[PDB]
């Protein structure tokens, strides 16, 4: 018995037909709109970021045995209860970094050569040239990158490509980035020499709240801050107050605190925070873009996460373990 | 000797009055059009920028000129003949910065990429959902085309290889350093049919007028998305626009093109207008084009050095050190 | 006598000061939950405006309160009974100017029916065209129904018979003047059912509380135009948004509604915010919605006048002289 | 009967074609500049719109014509001196819906005072505060001037003596009817000094051309509204545009504007463009100006009522009934 949460509409008939042998029950909505005669049922459920598996919801979930997030992240997933209950948990670590990378990147230079300003004035037919839109170069810039994996690696490399110095913070000290120009920090030292900087790190307990008061005030007057990680990386409420300071030339956020109220428009039953506001305040602004955590979304990740997902579902009903090694978060025992 | 400047900003104005002090300067934020035929006739030395049209009834008026220069890149502004027969020297400036256009239209690459002006839009709405019509590609699934490999164009393949993307390149002269990082030079036809994303950084000439016309827009690919940061008149804005609302583009990015300088100097106040410029205004609201007004070169690197570069020429020419200035000779001595 | 305003605007303080520079003064642009316990403890007369809340809870610091004077028509921001039980006489401004509010419902009704908003975003695309998306209706053949008939409503129905209207009215007390100038006075389900277009003049009381909820909504006409520039919880925000999402309205504008404070004065700065707060910014961007913040208000006849009476009261109540504001009492003497 | 229709829409095609199948008809959507030269010459009766341009070298064009019937109550279109002296009678629709236009006028005045457009974009921007650059002035305050007191512009001071205004009226014909509702009937130039909006509704001939120009506007009070729903060539569109930019204006609304048919049209497909065409573009992104592209009229009686005048008058005409139609004539019989 297989259950699937939070499917896109035009995914359905694919994971039925790519499913066909196996008793599945398919959800466009979230596990927790899910009938509890279906979460009793369930020993496979697949679901995605916005799917909270806390302790109280996987309670009733008593001949579950393997959860797989169609995602790199999995911090929406209470990962201690598994491992004390022995339930596995797969995800899929390398879909396509490169999508969150290049959207990464083309945050940041949509900042820096201001192209929303521009924008704003040619729509009034102001097609003049004042220092209002004088753009800065990359290649002038020092870039620093919290959290070298993956994504971030890569986020790296492009930078040295535009002739950027590159500063890094990482618990792993790549040899790959070193040996290209990279040069590894301490995270005082990135926060108060870079230009520009983007996070991407998991979040966990260690990356919980890291960019707030404190760190922001380490850092220039006039710096660019991209946030493709996760939303709770960032104190939104320490962001906002430093944005009204004019503390930054610009920020770029894919993925902010209470993001599911706006994303899943939860508004309509009766949800709202005062972070949600706050981003949409900030979205208007011209030194700003906020995207609704779509920087994973091109068609070669969908195309991968389908394919990845339907490998691990029949990996684990013939009891193959071994094939999907690399996909365990929680593996055996 | 006497030197005059026009379409100078008027920021820019202390920096020359006290750079250039020891000189018999006039400055105008002007172009030169605009200029007293009195002060056209003592001038030796012009500095214009690209929206100072110098044709043979203009330059005719300066009987005393020995030198032009524009603080620019581009050239075609210039009736370099006139100029040849006369023995009127033309200098510009070859490289302040070609890494600001070439970061600029990778900016223009990745907006249209990932579709970010579509998102904006839906976002203002407050419609946070994701669905097909915000569907993004991948840069590295994709094949760039190059048209012009010179000092930009050669900076542009290299960021679409560090990008993973397959890279064209179409140049007349083919650079054995661009080959041997990936660049495969191929012919015109070849780069246009198997392109996903062409951009163009070839100088404006009479070789390239319109060379991206009706029937070289039907040879690319559909969803091609088509980047000009080069100059308007290599691209025939009528079939551009014929093809853009027959739905060829995924995407355009124009910082430049036909008859700009209508909307960016705003001489509809003097009754000037063009269709063009009906046209690109039409298609600036689209949400899957980018207008910018000729500002791809606009950084602060490139202005320090444009104004260092341009100091340099001045006094260089007043001394008579030609030699200290030979790489910035269109038309050079004599 | 100790005198305390607040919510002042910043640009009215040296107004004030200076006309009441004899008496022991005390102004706050903030509002009166952000004052000083002993300034709340001297006060015998406070001057406030439509967001100072003024609780039993907030009253019970101000054992000397004498007089609350609110800068505005509306007083339901004040507890009447407790200050009726204490003693403490209330003022406020009955007519500044019910022409300002009366003439925005018709600047949003006008905004509507000639769909103003749509032919805007169509206008910035530079699409020109005439298509049945921006095809009008005429007032002249609506029926306008008028929910609260005083000095606001009445003005408001006047406008519509002036533009050829059928006018319906609803009201607890029925005017002859208005039945004299055609307005014909029904029950409030006759209106509903009957009106094309619903505008809303009531004070916020608990009879008028989401008065216009999920059942009355369901009685208009599909295709009905509402418009509140009352009090917001005189709607049912919640019941308006489901109707709105399945297509009911033809248009709706909104000066008042629920919760508008926390966007007026940006209280999620301090950490409120409510899914209504969401639901009227999505409304504001639709093309058929017009959302203005407590505004209709806002003109500088209005302000003046606010300005003039206020420095009448306050001068009468520190003199005996109660007749000459016995048309500003809500909870008079004794 | 051959009969010919031009700048039909699509939608009222199959209407005409019912409506007139007992004769020879022919129905074009597009302009009378794009008919073949043999329908023209067989044509007997024409109905028109106000785009079709029949200038003496067009209706030469036609030896045929004996009617030309335009769907509209203005005809500065057509040739009237070319008509006269060659027999060829003129119909219009004099009156299909005044009150289209006159509320029209009303919605942009309220727009402009109110300053909807304005604070739009701040609500857009989550700003629900209030300051002066929001603060608005009140109607009832302020004197309406109207040029014009015919149809249209008789229903417009009327409006504005519902609304409190002082209405001074400028006309060549005076009407008793206006004074007696309180109208005050002026000169120009006291008009234009002494209003606070003013508001155009004559027709467009050689006595009105640029009526409103540098010297007129020059009269008018610092901070005047000014409103346009008559005919773009009684305004100089270049003093206009001068005056604008010298902060003249409180606010513009313009449903009718110089040279706006190659916008409404989209000539610019054609090689057609004018300064005046980006003059108006600019003017119409900013927020105390409202452009309507000439659809003061587009309502859904007035499209009913022009349909029905439109088949009378051609039922009339075949069948020889000149009487029936006699209001309809602009050009009557000898
Ligand atoms: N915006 C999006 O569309 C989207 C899409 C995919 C992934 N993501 C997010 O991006 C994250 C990163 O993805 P990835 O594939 O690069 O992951 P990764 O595991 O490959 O890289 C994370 C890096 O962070 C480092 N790290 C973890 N904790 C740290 C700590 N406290 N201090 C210093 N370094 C630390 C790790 O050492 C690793 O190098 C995901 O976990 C997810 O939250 C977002
Ligand atoms: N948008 C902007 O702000 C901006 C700024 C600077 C320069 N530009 C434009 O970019 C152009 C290129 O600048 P660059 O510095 O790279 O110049 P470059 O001279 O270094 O490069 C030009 C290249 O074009 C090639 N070429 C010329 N004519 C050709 C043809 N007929 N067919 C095929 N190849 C041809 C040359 O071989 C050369 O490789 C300039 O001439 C200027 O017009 C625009
Ligand atoms: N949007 C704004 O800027 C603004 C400005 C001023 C006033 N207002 C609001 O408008 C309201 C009306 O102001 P006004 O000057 O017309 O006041 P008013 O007292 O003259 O009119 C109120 C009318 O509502 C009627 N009424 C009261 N309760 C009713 C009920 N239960 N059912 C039917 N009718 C009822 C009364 O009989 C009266 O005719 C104010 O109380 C205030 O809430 C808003
Ligand atoms: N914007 C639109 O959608 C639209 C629609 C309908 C009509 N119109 C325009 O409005 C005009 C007025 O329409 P109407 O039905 O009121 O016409 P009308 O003929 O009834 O009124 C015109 C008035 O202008 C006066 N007038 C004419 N020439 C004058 C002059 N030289 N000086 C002073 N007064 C003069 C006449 O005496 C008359 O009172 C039409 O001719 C047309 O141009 C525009």
Same mark, same amino acid.
């Given at each position: 018995n297989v259950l699937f949460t939070s499917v896109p509409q035009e995914d359905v008939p694919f994971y039925q037909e790519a499913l066909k042998d196996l008793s599945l029950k398919i959800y466009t909505?979230?596990?927790?709109?899910?009938?509890e005669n279906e979460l009793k049922k369930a020993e496979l459920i697949s679901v995605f970021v916005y799917d909270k598996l806390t302790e109280e919801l996987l309670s009733?979930?008593?001949?579950?045995?393997l959860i797989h997030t169609?995602?790199?992240?999995?911090?929406?997933?209470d990962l201690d209860y598994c491992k004390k209950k022995g339930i596995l948990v797969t995800h899929?670590? /390398?879909?396509?970094?490169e999508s969150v990378a290049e959207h990464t990147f083309a945050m940041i230079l949509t900042l820096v050569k201001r192209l929303k300003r521009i924008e704003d004035r040619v729509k009034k037919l102001n097609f003049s040239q004042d220092s209002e839109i004088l753009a800065r170069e990359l290649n002038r810039l020092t870039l620093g990158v919290i959290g070298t994996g993956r994504i971030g690696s890569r986020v790296a490399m492009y930078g040295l490509a535009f002739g950027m110095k590159v500063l890094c913070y990482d618990v792993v000290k790549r040899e790959d980035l070193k040996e290209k120009g990279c040069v590894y920090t301490s995270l005082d030292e990135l926060l108060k020499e870079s230009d520009v900087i983007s996070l991407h790190v998991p979040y966990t307990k260690e990356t919980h709240?890291?960019?707030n008061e404190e760190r922001i005030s380490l850092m220039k007057d006039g710096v660019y801050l991209i946030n493709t /990680?996760?939303?709770?990386?960032?104190?939104t409420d320490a962001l906002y107050r430093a944005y009204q300071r004019g503390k930054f030339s610009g920020l770029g956020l894919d993925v902010f605190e209470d993001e599911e109220i706006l994303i899943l428009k939860k508004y309509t039953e009766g949800k709202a925070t005062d972070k949600n506001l706050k981003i949409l305040e900030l979205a208007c602004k011209d030194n700003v873009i906020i995207t609704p955590?779509?920087?994973?979304?091109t068609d070669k990740s969908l195309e991968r996460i389908r394919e990845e997902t339907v490998k691990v579902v029949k990996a684990f009903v013939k009891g193959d373990l071994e094939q999907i090694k690399g996909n365990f978060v929680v593996g055996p025992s």
């Open positions: 909505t979230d596990v927790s709109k899910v009938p009733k979930m008593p001949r579950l045995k169609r995602s790199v992240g999995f911090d929406h997933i899929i670590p /390398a879909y396509s970094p709240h890291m960019i /990680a996760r939303g709770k990386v960032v104190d955590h779509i920087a994973y979304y």
